[PDB]
Amino acid sequence: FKIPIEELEDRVFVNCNTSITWVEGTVGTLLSDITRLDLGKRILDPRGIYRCNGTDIYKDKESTVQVHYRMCQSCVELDPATVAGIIVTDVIATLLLALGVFCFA
Amino acid sequence: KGNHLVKVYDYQEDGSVLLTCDAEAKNITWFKDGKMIGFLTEDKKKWNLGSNAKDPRGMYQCKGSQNKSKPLQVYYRMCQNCIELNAATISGFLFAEIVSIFVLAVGVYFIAGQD
Amino acid sequence: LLDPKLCYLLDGILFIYGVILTALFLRVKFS
Amino acid sequence: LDPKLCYLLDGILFIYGVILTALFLRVK
Amino acid sequence: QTPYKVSISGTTVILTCPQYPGSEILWQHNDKNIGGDNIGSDEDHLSLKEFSELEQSGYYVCYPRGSKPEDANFYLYLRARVCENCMEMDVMSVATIVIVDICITGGLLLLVYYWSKN
Amino acid sequence: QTPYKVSISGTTVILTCPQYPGSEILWQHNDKNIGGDEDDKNIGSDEDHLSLKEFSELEQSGYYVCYPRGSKPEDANFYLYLRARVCENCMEMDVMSVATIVIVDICITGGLLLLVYYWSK
Amino acid sequence: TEKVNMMSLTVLGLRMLFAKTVAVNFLLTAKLFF
Amino acid sequence: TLLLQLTNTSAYYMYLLLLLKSVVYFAIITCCLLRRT
Ligand SMILES: CC(C)CCC[C@@H](C)[C@H]1CC[C@H]2[C@@H]3CC=C4C[C@@H](O)CC[C@]4(C)[C@H]3CC[C@]12C
């Protein structure tokens, strides 16, 4: 018995038929109605473990589902060309700056 | 269809495009500008052109067991290198093309006076 | 995205150098 | 507006630093 | 054969189909007829004013009157994103402004050196 | 219970299943077998590993249940829900991870000069 | 949104390179006068 | 954002044009200093 993860426009929900007991991870927020839980915005990387109980068809069975998200918007596309083209000239600039210090003294 | 089989699938989460040759056959053969630039085996149907950020242009087509399909010129101006030439950037260009030149000249004047 | 908060880290570096040099200039000018 | 402020604050800080370096080195 | 030539100036998109010099041609966009009077359908030019990406991006077919659109030469797929009074920097103005800046710095610092050495 | 350590480097994603470290395990996806099928050699199982390449957001994003040999598929009491915007040659990096590089660069640049100046004896 | 971050990183790198190319020129010009 | 995307490349090229003048000045001062050795 899996725990359905419904999707609103930016809210990832956790739906059950009984009380949801958080185990370990991002608790997010609570909600007034029972058998529900909110995790917050889509771009938050909500990750945690939330075990649940059975339903009216699959009762006497404790279920557990872990939610994992990697919808990165803080990620940067590193390019071999750009990165190499900045470090190899930064080293040259540092070495040239280290030449005037020797020249003065 | 009218011998127009090549289609482009878009509107997904990521910035990528895929050419879909809507023709029943086996071992479909992709072309570009009339030449043999690509090939495909089974287990895959949508040829990949890369990202829309690199502006994939060209003139693409496919060919099945029947006669060759008809081309479809793809144009993608997702520039992302565009610079806004309003009344602030050109002013910024001039203010960076005068101060630097003036400092370089006031350094060269002292260098020559030393010489 | 992290662009708007990224310049002020580098611009902050230059303010430190400017204030240090103002301190030394005042020290070597008044005294 | 906010992003453009940094690219003009760096210029004024750079000019101030160069001017104060030149005027401080004058004392020699 | 000859492909559709597209040119984007500022925020206005204008494209041509150079296969029939003189004829009565029609244009379509996702089987939505465009032409016959906003928008402009010239003899072989079409001008897409207010080219917003989310409403004009699809299949354009150029063909003379009396012919089925599916029996034309080929189609087009346009996904252009345009802005107001803005340019794009390919290697035609990025390898030119650099050259002119070098040739003007070299031509001005040399003059300053000549003026200061006298 | 022990979590499924999800390691995502570039496009390859590696899942670990330490729930049964003393047997041979398999994998499933929407009640469909995946891994150990000896086809589409990009994927592949191990003692606990599972490497999936050419990952996409649209497909292959659901329940990854790991169970050992001789185990009914609905016997496990743990499931995963992996929805990842797998990317090409890019990694997560915040402002703190860039200030620590700027400061290190400043320090190493300062270090070189303080040594060349002493080298002039 | 994954390329704006790289553009900002490259701009910061160019700023950092410029802040050293100015210092090198200034140090050499100061040497020219002593 | 379509504003930050343009703002970043409107300053990337500006700093790519102030780096080809520092190299010119470095060449000038190197030529002026190599004549004294
Ligand atoms: C930023 C780049 C392009 C130009 C920098 C020019 C700098 C390096 C030049 C401009 C004027 C110069 C100064 C002019 C006069 C003197 C007085 C002398 O007794 C010691 C050197 C000193 C103090 C010079 C140091 C170098 C100096 C500050």
Numbering used by the authors:
A (entry chain d): 22 to 126
B (entry chain g): 26 to 140
C (entry chain a): 26 to 56
D (entry chain b): 27 to 54
E (entry chain f): 33 to 69, 74 to 154
F (entry chain e): 33 to 153
G (entry chain m): 256 to 289
H (entry chain n): 252 to 288
Give passages from the manuscript.
After antigen engagement, the γδ TCR–CD3 complex triggers the phosphorylation of ITAMs within the cytoplasmic tails of CD3 subunits, initiating downstream events.
The cryo-EM map revealed well-resolved TM and membrane-proximal segments, enabling us to assign most side chains in this region. The overall structure of the Vγ9Vδ2 TCR–CD3 complex resembles a bifurcated tree, with CD3εγ and CD3ε′δ ECDs representing two primary branches and the TMD serving as the stem. In particular, numerous membrane-embedded, interchain hydrogen bonds are observed. The interfaces of TCRγ9–TCRδ2, TCRδ2–CD3ε′δ, TCRγ9–CD3εγ and TCRγ9δ2–CD3ζζ′ register at least 13 hydrogen bonds. The resolved portion of the Vγ9Vδ2 TCR–CD3 structure approximately resembles the αβ TCR–CD3 structure, with a root mean squared deviation of 0.8 Å over 240 aligned Cα atoms. As predicted previously, the TCRδ2 and TCRγ9 TM helices occupy positions corresponding to TCRα and TCRβ, respectively. In the αβ TCR–CD3 complex, the TCRα and TCRβ ECDs stack against CD3 ECDs through Cα and Cβ domains, and their CPs tightly bind to the Cα and Cβ domains.
